[PDB]
Design a protein around this ligand. Structure first.
Ligand SMILES: Nc1nc(N)c(NC(=O)Nc2ccc(C(=O)N[C@@H](CCC(=O)O)C(=O)O)cc2)c(=O)[nH]1
Ligand SMILES: Nc1ncnc2c1ncn2[C@@H]1O[C@H](COP(=O)(O)OP(=O)(O)O)[C@@H](O)[C@H]1OP(=O)(O)O
Length: 291
């Protein structure tokens, strides 16, 4: 069947309008306009592209931003000095450290250096802890994005088989967490039956599991990891992969769009929604209502 191709770009646009209305409403009440401080380390052109999209989108919804550049050979200590300063600046509502960081910087240490209340990526251990206990939290943007695409398309999760191909602590694990957890908890989940796959799932076992799946979510960085033979007729296929090989996903799109009932393209799928959900988090953080 010809898959319905989900426009992340368009959905992100609708959602940015909602956040824009949200920001004006917050400022209409006597409150400070959200300010997002972004730290970009080094010269990765993809990292530079994503931060520009984030600043441009922030501007569009009336969220102030400032870009703090650091060179690739910056120290862990120097990064934590900046995060400390930003934590103490009451005009900064949100702090984002673009990943990945240089190999000599411990990611987990920097993530934990951001005040939870300002942690718009939700990578701080307290925010991860609260996510894993289904409490109100700043929910990681890409994970939020996937959940939002699913809900606004009307893809049913409740009682459904879902495979998450990816266990990363920033993307994979949060997706598994949102999708499988109780619909009635403080932070509702999808009530889906979730299989977690990763680099040590034999491909033959991954296929056996995807074949039974009502939803495949792949966040692997392996072009054509998901081939049409792996997909159940009518299934939803959410492609979080970004592969510069030409930009392609983890899904064999031209084949899988003939088998699936719903597919996200790359580019134009999860990417723009990552940006949108970060801005939602930036507004939410500014209102200081979780902590
Ligand atoms: N701290 C932190 N680091 C991170 N690395 C991420 N992820 C993180 O920025 N992802 C991301 C991926 C793609 C796009 C994007 O704009 N994608 C478009 C355009 C792609 C392109 O021009 O190359 C698309 O898929 O259509 C934006 C953000 C994050 O959310 N927080
Ligand atoms: N063949 C495969 N099948 C399913 N998932 C795979 C996969 N190969 C990689 N992945 C997963 O896709 C994800 C890639 O995410 P990532 O690049 O952000 O990695 P990291 O967690 O090290 O930062 C990983 O969770 C990865 O599994 P590992 O934790 O074992 O590295």
């Amino acid at each position: 069947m010809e898959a319905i191709i989900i426009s992340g770009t368009e959905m992100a646009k609708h959602i940015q309008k909602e956040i824009q209305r949200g920001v004006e409403s917050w400022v209409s009440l006597g409150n400070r306009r959200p300010h997002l401080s972004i730290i970009l380390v080094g010269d990765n052109p993809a990292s530079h592209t994503y931060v520009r999209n984030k600043i441009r989108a922030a501007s569009a919804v009336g969220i102030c931003s400032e870009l703090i550049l650091k060179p690739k050979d910056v120290s862990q200590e120097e990064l934590l000095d900046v995060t400390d300063q930003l934590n103490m600046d009451p005009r900064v509502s949100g702090i984002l450290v673009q990943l990945p960081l240089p190999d000599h910087v411990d990611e987990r240490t920097i993530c934990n250096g951001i005040a939870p209340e300002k942690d718009v990526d939700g990578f701080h251990i307290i925010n991860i802890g609260r996510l894993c206990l289904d409490q109100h939290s700043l929910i990681p943007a890409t994970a939020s994005a996937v959940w939002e695409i699913i809900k606004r398309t009307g893809i049913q999760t409740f009682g459904k088989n879902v495979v998450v191909a990816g266990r990363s602590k920033n993307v994979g694990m949060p997706i598994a967490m949102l999708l499988h957890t109780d619909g009635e908890h403080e932070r509702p989940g999808g009530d889906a039956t979730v299989t977690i796959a990763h680099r040590y799932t034999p491909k033959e076992q991954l296929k056996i599991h995807t074949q039974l799946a009502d939803i495949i979510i792949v966040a692997a960085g392996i072009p054509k990891l998901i081939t049409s033979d792996m997909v159940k007729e009518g299934a939803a296929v959410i492609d979080v992969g970004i592969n510069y090989v030409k930009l392609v996903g983890d899904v064999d799109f031209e084949a899988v769009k003939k088998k699936a009932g719903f597919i996200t393209p790359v580019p134009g799928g999860v990417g723009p929604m990552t940006v949108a959900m970060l801005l939602k988090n930036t507004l939410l953080a500014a209102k200081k209502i979780i902590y």
